[PDB]
Design a protein around this ligand. Structure first.
Ligand SMILES: Nc1nc2[nH]cnc2c(=O)[nH]1
Ligand SMILES: Nc1nc2[nH]cnc2c(=O)[nH]1
Ligand SMILES: Nc1nc2[nH]cnc2c(=O)[nH]1
Ligand SMILES: Nc1nc2[nH]cnc2c(=O)[nH]1
Ligand SMILES: [Mg+2]
Ligand SMILES: [Mg+2]
Lengths: 256, 254, 254, 255
């Protein structure tokens, strides 16, 4: 007997636990959300016939807790052999359980597979910074790579990179939109690549990138948004901004 | 932490084929199409490169490649400098062909080859929307007994409800020429895999050979597309007459 | 009449590309996919063989192959004994590569490879169902002026209303990432080809370059599938980033 | 200016003209129909926007006339720049004009392209006879190849071949019969002997039917051929001693 519905499998992690290392002020310097895509969501209807869907979850960055991804997979797996009366019931339980875990109302949209037919694979906004003629040999984390990286003229720009890797490896693309002194692209790319051997949660990586850019580069406004490939059937896409609340859509990128 | 072909582990196709009562003379042709979503290495100067790999392994190869070993092998690229993308392709073809036992094709695609690519569904009629009760989940090939008693047709059917055992998940497309299949029988048969344990490639061959022995179509193609595990997916294709699928685009859950 | 490669007539791609104001370094990559519905020859013992040929000619080739000459060339096979299907596939690759000026890929498929293959449509949203009036039929690329003023999107659009000139007929799929396109403008633009004269390959390159210069998408793919003439069809694919379509399946009118 | 709707482009050909050469009885020894597929049907709606469809036409084998294929193509092309108020109108005109040409009511379906999505490519019923270990060097027509071809035990069977060529035109042919079992080598050599031979598809099917009836004398017989299109149109003649039509007009691999 596979284990059936079990909300106790969900594991909260307080966001303050990692934010402590970032030495943040009393107020959070960002707002935003963690958007998750649940590619494996499946359960049984009343009559025992399997149902399959994709879930799209948004957890506020102000929630007391994030949800540990493994535990989230195990919790979703507990639906697989459980009978539910309706799709509405499934969506309601996901909101209830994930909101209890996070400590703040979590948004959930349970979508049938046909909602995805002809949907696009997308890239990120702005210019890709990856095509550089530089040598890298040190992959150890080094925030000081951002020392003096913003010395250009005042600009609004959006940059992105597909070279984010952190630690089993996690793989992501990251979009950085800002208004401030123009950022040195070589410094930025070396800084991003220095995560390659570093071990932090995706949500934390994004908050670290945001806070390092804010402290070294002092833009007037900033958004950092990363989209990671799935682990265990789930992906996370942390969005952190000085002024925006969320990305426009949750459209997948090429490796997602 | 460096490139290491010894990480690849073959599994002989003969194990399950003997279990299906097959001759070494196969009743199908085809291939296993793999998508490698996490392919990454370093260029000549140490700057990371990322790509998606598209691999086709002939169904006649002695071995399939065990997926986790495939993951670990690919990870061994991550901190290795390679002279060019052509070098990477070359190594992949060499190593994967040696492991499978027959020449494997490999296409290493840059990520921008996927911009504005659409998600696809499968062809023909989805059979999943049936108001039926499933009273148990044991595998039962005899669900197909007498399932093909209709008039001679050529049609294509699909289901998104394939699962085996962590769970794996797939959609499957069945194109045939023969006596028309009972859609309820077919759906019950597919659902009965849920608590079955075998590899994706093996499941597809089981589906193919069961439909053959119970339904006796003149022509049959079975093509399944499974969600990834460990950053790679497998899409086994088995056909009476066709060597490869004429499309390879990702589905909603992939 | 025996096998005769001198029947093939090349047409240089440069003629129309110069007319489109293209540099020798192209703004697209891609290929022309041909389907040879009437391929037939004699085996060693004089017994007729029939097959469907699938040919891909790189868009970088110096020449395209003129369709009527391609038909005449294929007809020269009809009363010629060839030792095996591999011999036929070899001759085709050799002759078509020499004519195009670059290696052409050829698959010679038996007819039973198509049994129970489904007809396909194109992906994304069809733009044809518009309640608009067309007041004249002259080609006008300026119909695209200001046509891309929407928000940044990635989407796929298609139309079945492509016609050029005896008339030719096609459907066209346009996938792009850029400012959202006005569908009325796009449909008018495509309808304005109706009484225009150029080759399919040239039409597609004109569509690509007109969209690129009026709409300025970040990336663009244009893939047209035309109905056959003389037993063969042409399906030109042109893309910023992709080298080939990830499907090759016939549509309703093909 | 493209030439607009012109029903005078259609060219009738009396069926009796070719049937002469087959020396038939007073009454026809067969019934059936010619099913045509019109893959490039297109016209303009009342606002000038192009419309595209696939037509499916059935002409009774009893019609006084068949329709010459090139003329049929030219007639359909005359729709391309012509405005019509509705699809129903287009269907109505096609029935009227094609029926007047043929001399007997013709059925016409005008189908939107989406009615073809996921439709199958099909093969023919029964056994393919093409995989034989025989040498052929003479491609001249020879009906005498069927002399004594049906000696076997009494059987019902269906046979098909993809090797029909005549003038090049390309087809597959399905032969269902009840009678003394037919020699497959003789049948295939006979079909291959059309390879350098000039006759209309409808006539080829009638010649095959009448040659098999005379040399093999089955109790019942159907001959159905499906040819690849010429000029955007295909023709699929069906002739039978006891059946009226095939079940569907589904395309084969080369069609
Ligand atoms: N939420 C969350 N859970 C994890 N468990 C392992 N890695 C992660 C991560 O990056 N984010
Ligand atoms: N090739 C292969 N390897 C596996 N390892 C675990 N499951 C699978 C599978 O389905 N296929
Ligand atoms: N290659 C080619 N040859 C032709 N001959 C006449 N039209 C065409 C065409 O569109 N393409
Ligand atoms: N109806 C008809 N017309 C033709 N015109 C040229 N060939 C043919 C044919 O086989 N049938
Ligand atoms: Mg995603
Ligand atoms: Mg047809």
């Amino acid at each position: 007997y596979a284990n059936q519905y079990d909300p106790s499998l969900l594991q909260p992690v307080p966001r303050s636990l990692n934010r402590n290392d970032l030495h943040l002020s009393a107020t959070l310097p960002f707002q935003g959300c963690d958007i998750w895509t649940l590619y494996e969501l499946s359960w049984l209807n009343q009559k025992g016939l399997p149902q399959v869907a994709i879930g799209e979850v948004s957890i506020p960055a102000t929630s007391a807790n994030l949800i540990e991804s493994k535990s989230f997979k195990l919790y979703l797996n507990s639906y697989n052999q459980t009978r539910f009366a309706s799709w509405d019931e499934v969506q309601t339980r996901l909101v209830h359980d994930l909101s209890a875990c996070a400590g703040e109302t979590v948004t959930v949209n349970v979508k049938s597979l046909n909602e995805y037919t002809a949907e696009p694979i997308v890239t990120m906004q702005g210019e890709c910074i990856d095509d550089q003629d530089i040598e890298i040999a040190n992959y150890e984390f080094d925030d000081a790579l951002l020392q003096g990286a913003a010395q250009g003229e005042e600009v609004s720009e959006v940059l992105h990179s597909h070279l984010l890797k952190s630690n089993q490896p996690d793989w992501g693309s990251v979009e950085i939109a800002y208004h401030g002194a123009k950022m040195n692209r070589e410094a930025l790319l070396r800084y991003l690549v220095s995560f390659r051997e570093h071990n932090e949660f995706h949500e934390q990586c994004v908050e670290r990138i945001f806070t390092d850019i804010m402290r070294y580069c002092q833009p007037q406004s900033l958004t950092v948004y990363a989209r990671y490939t799935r682990r265990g059937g789930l992906d996370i896409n942390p969005f952190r901004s000085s002024h925006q609340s969320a990305p426009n859509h949750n459209q997948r990128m090429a490796r997602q």
